[PDB]
Every structure is written in structure tokens, then in C-alpha cells.
Amino acid sequence: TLDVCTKYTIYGFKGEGIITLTNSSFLAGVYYTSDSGQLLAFKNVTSGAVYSVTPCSFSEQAAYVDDDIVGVISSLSSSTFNSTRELPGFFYHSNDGSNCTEPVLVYSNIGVCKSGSIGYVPSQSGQVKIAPTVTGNISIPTNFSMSIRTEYLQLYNTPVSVDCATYVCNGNSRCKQLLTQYTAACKTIESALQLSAR
């Protein structure tokens, strides 16, 4: 079956997908696979018919709003939403096709308002600094105000200790004498943690 979502069973490669025609040309080779090992495009001998299959499933990026979904981002024009606008690189899906003015959720140069409208965020105005001048004129600042800015930093981390034997031996006696063969890892950890703690 062609160009429909169907149960494909091909040369010991089975599954569900949609097949598509392609016009490639190669005098040799009949099947061509992906890095993962799945086969996308292939040809058949007698007619050289080359076909590419596609999964009957794809991903998308949807936005959670307040307590619901209002915006969806996909690659297919069709959607359950009223409107779908083809923005560069993707389809935006929503029932609100208006213009975003006070974005509530912003990613990259893009942002979305509460109503769901999307928009391009203009760059925020930066602080202005006046360079020195030899002569002529200057706009000397005056009439100053206050602004307090925030900063934090976490300083120290609590240490922890473990006894490998107890952690691995829950009371057995034969265990330790058997495991006498190799213990140096326990040594490395204890010394390291102890010196680190101190």
C-alpha cells in the first residue's frame, strides 16, 4: 500500500509506517538504513522503484498555561486549534491569533502572553555610560538615587561517611574473610573523605 499508514512487513523488517516515493538513482544496492539500524529509503529491482517510509508518529512542543494548554508547536499545518501560523522553523498552534504585547513566557527572542499570542521580543534597553571628552560639552550626572542588587553564593558542603564492609556485609563473618582478597578501594575512599572533611 502506498502513502498510507499501514503495517509494513519487509525483508525481515516489520512495523507500522507511511511509505513515500523518491526518485533517487543507484546502479547497486537495494536497501538503505539509518544510524540506529532502521531502514528509511530503498529501491526495488525490476523497476528501480525507490521508496522512503515514515513513522506514523512525531513529536511536538506544547506550552502549559495557568492550568491548561493554549499553545502548540508542531510541523503539520493541521491542528485541533482554531489557528496555526507558520513561523520560521515551526508551526504555532493556538485559538488566539492576536499579537502578544506583555509576554508572560519568553524563550529566545520570542515570548508568549497570557492570552497565548506569540511575539518577537525587542531587545531591552541597556544602561547608559558617558565617555570622557577633551573639550566642548558634557552631560555630567546629578540628582542620584538608590538601587539594590541581589547576590548569593553557597559556601560549604556537608561531608558523609560510609563503612564499605558494613554497607556490603550485613553481619556475616565468612564474608570478610572471603573478601580479604581485595579491599584497597575501601582505603582510598576513607582516606579521601577523612582528609576532605578535615
Partner 1 sequence: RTEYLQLYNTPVSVDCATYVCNGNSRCKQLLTQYTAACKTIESALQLSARLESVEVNSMLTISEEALQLATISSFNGDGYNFTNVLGVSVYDPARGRVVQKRSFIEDLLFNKVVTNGLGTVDEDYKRCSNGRSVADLVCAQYYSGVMVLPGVVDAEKLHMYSASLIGGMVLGGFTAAAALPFSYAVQARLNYLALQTD
Partner 2 sequence: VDALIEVQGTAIQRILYCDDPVSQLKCSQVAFDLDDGFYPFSSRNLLSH
Partner 3 sequence: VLQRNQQLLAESFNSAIGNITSAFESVKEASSQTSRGLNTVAHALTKVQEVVNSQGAALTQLTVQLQHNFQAISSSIDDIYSRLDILSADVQVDRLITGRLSALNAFVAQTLTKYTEVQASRKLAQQKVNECVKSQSQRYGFCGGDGEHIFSLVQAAPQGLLFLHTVLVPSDFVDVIAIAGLCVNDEIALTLREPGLVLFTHELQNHTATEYFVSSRRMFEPRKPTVSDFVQIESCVVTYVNLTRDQL
Ligand X SMILES: *[C@@H]1O[C@H](CO)[C@@H](O[C@@H]2O[C@H](CO)[C@@H](O[C@@H]3O[C@H](CO[C@H]4O[C@H](CO)[C@@H](O)[C@H](O)[C@@H]4O)[C@@H](O)[C@H](O[C@H]4O[C@H](CO)[C@@H](O)[C@H](O)[C@@H]4O)[C@@H]3O)[C@H](O)[C@H]2NC(C)=O)[C@H](O)[C@H]1NC(C)=O
Ligand Y SMILES: *[C@@H]1O[C@H](CO[C@@H]2O[C@@H](C)[C@@H](O)[C@@H](O)[C@@H]2O)[C@@H](O)[C@H](O)[C@H]1NC(C)=O
Ligand Z SMILES: *[C@@H]1O[C@H](CO[C@@H]2O[C@@H](C)[C@@H](O)[C@@H](O)[C@@H]2O)[C@@H](O[C@@H]2O[C@H](CO)[C@@H](O[C@@H]3O[C@H](CO)[C@@H](O)[C@H](O)[C@@H]3O)[C@H](O)[C@H]2NC(C)=O)[C@H](O)[C@H]1NC(C)=O
Q: Where on the chain is the footprint of partner 2 (CB under 8 A)?
A: 5, 56-69, 74, 104-105, 107
Specify the DSSP class assigned to residue 52: E
How far apart are alpha carbons 21 and 54 in whole angstroms? 11
How far apart are alpha carbons 23 and 197 in whole angstroms? 68
Residue 196 CB, nearest approach to partner 3 (Å): 6
Q: Is 133 in the site for ligand X (CB under 6 A)?
A: no
- DSSP run (H or E) holding 175: helix 174-179
Residue 41 CB, nearest approach to ligand Y (Å): 8
Residue 15 contacts residue 53 (beta carbons within 8 Å) = no
According to CB under 6 A, which residues from 100 to 129 bind ligand Z?
118-119
Give the one residue of 44, 49, 85, 90 binding partner 1; rule: CB under 8 A. Answer: 90
Partners of 105 in the beta sheet?
A: 112
Residue 129 CB, nearest approach to ligand X (Å): 18
**Cell 525490476 found at:** 46
According to CB under 6 A, which residues from 80 to 99 bind ligand X?
82, 95
Among the listed residues 51, 11, 48, 52, the one whose alpha carbon sits nearest the alpha carbon of residue 26: 48
**Which cell numbers hold the place of 18?**
507511511
Residues binding partner 1 (CB under 8 A): 16, 20-24, 32, 34-36, 38, 40-41, 52, 54-59, 61, 75-76, 88-90, 107-109, 123-134, 136-139, 158-163, 166-167, 197
Residues binding ligand X (CB under 6 A): 82, 95, 136-137, 142-143
